[PDB]
């Protein structure tokens, strides 16, 4: 009934264990399932919830045609309990082509961007009511984390970006208390392009690992001080870069300060967090496509520049299966905060031409201090059996 502080240490993480799966595409061939893209998982103090950006249609529908578009006025934010598929009883909390959500210990904060690409509106819904709204400041596509934000002591840090996806863009950090923007802070540091951050609490502040769509394959790091409202930026120092377009393990490079200019181009939403000096990260197995997904810990990857020592590799999704976005979230335990990650499994068009729609499933893993094993959890939907 009080605010969340995340004032506990971090779990000892030896790897990750399976937590949840949504067989949305398998269930949608004979069921009423929303067509979705870009999900995430945010946990209130009681349970965990899955969020998606639905296209305002079901899969077994005529409106599933030409779903591949990402910014339509019919896109909504779908909220469900984690494990429950997105069926006709799902709640659409807001209109959004991009959204973020946390729980501050009292209520839910949803940041939702809609409108036009030239002129966009970001609404802030707290406790079921609209509290504040902002407009585009660069008159570009106003975007957001497309994951959770960090809700520390009633202060919320949402990283929004406005600008080119192939050039300099104005990235701001909004500090919001109870739905009201109390501070705005421009991005400061050596990061040159910040987009779709995955943020986690690192008390007393917030650490975000984002994507770079301009001259970067290593991921930017944004550290946010919520008391001083101050921002610093750098790059992941782990050598083995984590953007889905990237060079091979031999020719990859990642120094701490500047983007590596090594297949910068596009990107994928990913995540990475720190283990004192180690770095736990996850990346697609394929180096050019979003096919497969592995997670591993790099020794001295948060401290030593360009360190390519890898331990504790898990194969979440095999190379012969379609992955997608991924993101981090944090769960408060009895004594210390655990780190978990969701992986998007994209099924549909622009790669599979036997169908006209484009949707996703989600597989959620959580960190463990114990033993685990090997496995494989793809979507596993026969594309020839689908409408």
């Amino acid at each position, epitope marked *: 009934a009080e605010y969340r502080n995340w004032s506990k240490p971090q779990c000892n993480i030896t790897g990750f264990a399976p937590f949840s799966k949504d067989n949305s595409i398998r269930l949608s061939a004979g069921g009423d399932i929303w067509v979705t893209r870009e999900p995430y998982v945010s946990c209130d103090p009681d349970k965990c919830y899955q969020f998606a950006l639905g296209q305002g249609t079901t899969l077994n529908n005529g409106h599933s045609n030409d779903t*591949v*578009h*990402d*910014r339509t006025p019919y896109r909504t934010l779908l909220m469900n309990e984690l494990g429950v598929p997105f069926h006709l009883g799902t709640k659409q909390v807001c209109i959004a082509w991009s959204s973020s959500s946390c729980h501050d210990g009292k209520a839910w904060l949803h940041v939702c961007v809609t409108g036009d*690409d*030239e002129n966009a509106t970001a609404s802030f819904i707290y406790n079921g009511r609209l509290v504040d709204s902002i407009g585009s400041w660069s008159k*570009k*596509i106003l975007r957001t984390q497309e994951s959770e934000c960090v809700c520390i002591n009633g202060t919320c840090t949402v990283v929004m970006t406005d*600008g*080119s*996806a*192939s*050039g*300099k863009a104005d990235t701001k950090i909004l500090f919001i208390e109870e739905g009201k923007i109390v501070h705005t802070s421009p991005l400061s540091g050596s990061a040159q392009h910040v987009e779709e951050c995955s943020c986690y609490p690192r008390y007393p502040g917030v650490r975000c690992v984002c994507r770079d769509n301009w001259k970067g394959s290593n991921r930017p790091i944004v550290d946010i001080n919520v008391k001083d409202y101050s921002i610093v930026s750098s790059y992941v120092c782990s050598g083995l870069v984590g953007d889905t*377009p990237r060079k091979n393990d031999s020719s990859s490079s990642s120094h701490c300060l500047d983007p590596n200019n090594e*297949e*910068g*181009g*596009h990107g994928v939403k990913g995540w990475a967090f720190d283990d004192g000096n180690d770095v736990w990260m996850g990346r697609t197995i394929s180096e*050019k*496509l979003r096919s497969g997904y592995e997670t591993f810990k790099v020794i001295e990857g948060w401290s030593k520049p360009n360190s390519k020592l890898q331990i504790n590799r898990q194969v979440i999704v095999d190379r012969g299966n379609r992955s997608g976005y991924s993101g981090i979230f944090s769960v408060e335990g009895k004594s210390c905060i655990n780190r978990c990650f969701y992986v998007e499994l994209i099924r549909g068009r*622009k*790669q599979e*031409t036997e169908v006209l729609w*484009t949707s996703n499933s989600i597989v959620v893993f959580c960190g463990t201090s114990g033993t685990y094993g090997t496995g494989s959890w793809p979507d596993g939907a026969d594309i020839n059996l689908m409408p």
Partner: antibody
Framework: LVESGAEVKKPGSSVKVSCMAS????????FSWVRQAPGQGLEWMGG????????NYAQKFQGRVTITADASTSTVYMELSSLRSEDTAVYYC??????????????????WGQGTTVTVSS | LTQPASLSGSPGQSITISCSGS?????????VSWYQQHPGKAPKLIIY???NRPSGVSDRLSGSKSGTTASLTISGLQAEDEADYYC??????????FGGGTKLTVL
């Protein structure tokens, strides 16, 4: 879809070609410029998304071509300075059929213009 | 990208035009486009995304990819299919790379 008329220029000058798209709002789409010398193939000079106003150029055309855009009118301009002798060609403006998105980031070339011939002479 | 300089075929048969390239070229990305240019006319897109085909384009044109070489197959070679044929690919960093052009000639 509509381009500027053919222009006659002397070597060492600068030429400005235009391409206006009509039929809706195409600020978020991708506009590219293609060169075809008489009798030769197609060469991709570079592209632009008029919303983002950040052009991309080919490796061989950097430092010579300037691509600008007006997103309200959905018009793309290409300025080619230092008109060397072998710059005579036909210049095409092309536009993606899909807007910018996560799965559509490459400059697709679906709707083509009619062309504009520039002739470096004397 | 590398393309044959010219091809010839008989009316009613099927012809195939190849487009070869490196790994950074066709072979790592599935963004391969085929354009058709009749003499004195602007290029026209006939294939995009390796296999996909725009509306209003004849079903006789079928694009395909195998390894690092893309292929355009024209079945039922008619006399209106005599044109230059160009292959384009995504280079990798906001860059497109073209072919050389194939002078298809029906007999």
């Amino acid at each position: 879809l509509v381009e500027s008329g053919a222009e006659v220029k002397k070597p060492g000058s600068s030429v400005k070609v235009s391409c206006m798209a009509s039929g809706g709002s195409f600020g978020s789409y991708g506009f590219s410029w293609v060169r075809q010398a008489p009798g030769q193939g197609l060469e991709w000079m570079g592209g632009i998304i008029p919303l983002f106003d950040t052009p991309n150029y080919a490796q061989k055309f950097q430092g010579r071509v300037t691509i600008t855009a007006d997103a309200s009118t959905s018009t793309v301009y290409m300025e080619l300075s230092s008109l060397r002798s072998e710059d005579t060609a036909v210049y095409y403006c092309a536009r993606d059929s899909l807007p910018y998105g996560d799965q559509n980031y490459y400059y697709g070339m679906h709707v083509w213009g009619q062309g504009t011939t520039v002739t470096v002479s004397s | 990208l590398t393309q044959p300089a010219s091809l010839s075929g008989s009316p009613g048969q099927s012809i195939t035009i190849s487009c070869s390239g490196s790994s950074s070229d066709i072979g790592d990305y599935n963004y391969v486009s085929w354009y058709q240019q009749h003499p004195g006319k602007a290029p026209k897109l006939i294939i995009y995304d390796v296999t996909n085909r725009p509306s209003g384009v004849s079903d006789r044109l079928s694009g395909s990819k195998s390894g690092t070489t893309a292929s355009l197959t024209i079945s039922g070679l008619q006399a209106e299919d005599e044109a230059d044929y160009y292959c384009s690919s995504y280079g990798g960093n906001y860059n497109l790379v073209f072919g050389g052009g194939t002078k298809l000639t029906v007999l």
